[PDB]
From a paper:
The isoform [name] belongs to a subfamily of selenium-containing GPX enzymes and is unique in that it can also reduce hydroperoxides in complex lipids such as phospho­lipids, cholesterol and cholesteryl ester hydroperoxides, even when they are inserted into biomembranes or lipoproteins. The catalytic mechanism of the GPX reaction involves redox shuttling of this selenocysteine between the redox states selenol (Se–H) and selenenic acid (Se–OH). The catalytic site of GPX enzymes was initially suggested to consist of a catalytic triad formed by a selenocysteine, a glutamine and a tryptophan residue. This was later extended by a conserved asparagine to form a catalytic tetrad, which in human [name] consists of Sec46, Gln81, Trp136 and Asn137. Recently, [name] has been identified as a key player in ferroptosis, a non-apoptotic cell death resulting from the iron-dependent accumulation of lipid reactive-oxygen species.
To prevent the heterogenous modification observed both with the racemic mixture of [name] and with the pure enantio­mers, we produced a mutant form of [name] in which the second reactive cysteine, Cys66, was mutated to a serine (termed GPX4C66S). Mutation of Cys66 to serine, along with optimization of binding reaction conditions and the use of enantiomerically pure (S)-[name], enabled the determination of a co-crystal structure at 1.54 Å resolution. The crystal belonged to space group P212121, with one GPX4C66S molecule per asymmetric unit. Clear difference density allowed the building of a complete inhibitor [name] covalently linked to Sec46. As expected from mass spectrometry, the Cl atom of the inhibitor is lost and the acetamide moiety forms a covalent bond to the Se atom of Sec46. In the absence of a deep binding pocket within the active site of [name], it occupies a shallow surface pocket at Sec46 where, in addition to the covalent bond to Sec46, it also forms interactions with the three other residues of the catalytical tetrad (Gln81, Trp136 and Asn137). The side chain of Gln81 adopts a new conformation and rotates away from Sec46, which further enlarges the otherwise very small active site. Surprisingly, the thiophene group of the inhibitor does not engage in any interactions and instead is directed towards the solvent. By interacting with Sec46, Gln81, Trp136 and Asn137, the inhibitor targets all of the residues of the catalytic tetrad of [name] and thus fully blocks the active site.
Numbering used by the authors: 6 to 171
The structure:
Amino acid sequence: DDWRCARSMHEFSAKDIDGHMVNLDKYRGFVCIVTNVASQXGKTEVNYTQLVDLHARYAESGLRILAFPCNQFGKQEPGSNEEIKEFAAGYNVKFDMFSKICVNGDDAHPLWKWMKIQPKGKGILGNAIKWNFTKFLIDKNGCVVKRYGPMEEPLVIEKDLPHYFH
Ligand SMILES: *CC(=O)N(c1ccc(OC)c(Cl)c1)[C@@H](C(=O)NCCc1ccccc1)c1cccs1
């Protein structure tokens, strides 16, 4: 793996929640929120509902959202990809759902390895993803511009968006 010398999210690919490989260069020109999700957390509802709200209000300006299920934080994403897809449909998710991945350790998805080492990808303590619903904001060139932690509701991202819609 060569993820350490990539300069953009657009260099990566990942399987969507149906199992189909997606080239992330399709997000060239778009502002993106990339987030790790889980279905069985106290903060699942607030995160899904607010992401849906942001997508509803900003998709017209080029906001896209990429949600990666992950079972590494309390084992609270135990379901199959098909089950998680249906779960997300219950919140009327219209953004992009991906297949379940790891975000930490040697088998972390390479996009996640890459985001964590970006200058604006470092967490408050360090690079490791700490819990469910970490959020990365990605500019139109696929560069990491901000990271928001598990404790930060997605609506805190809203005030930062206008700058990246130039
Ligand atoms: C996914 C998550 O954030 N989370 C969690 C929930 C449940 C379980 O085990 C059953 C585990 Cl290991 C982690 C949080 C959490 O949601 N805390 C709020 C209280 C709650 C809400 C709904 C369901 C169960 C608990 C936890 C992190 C540490 C302990 S619980």
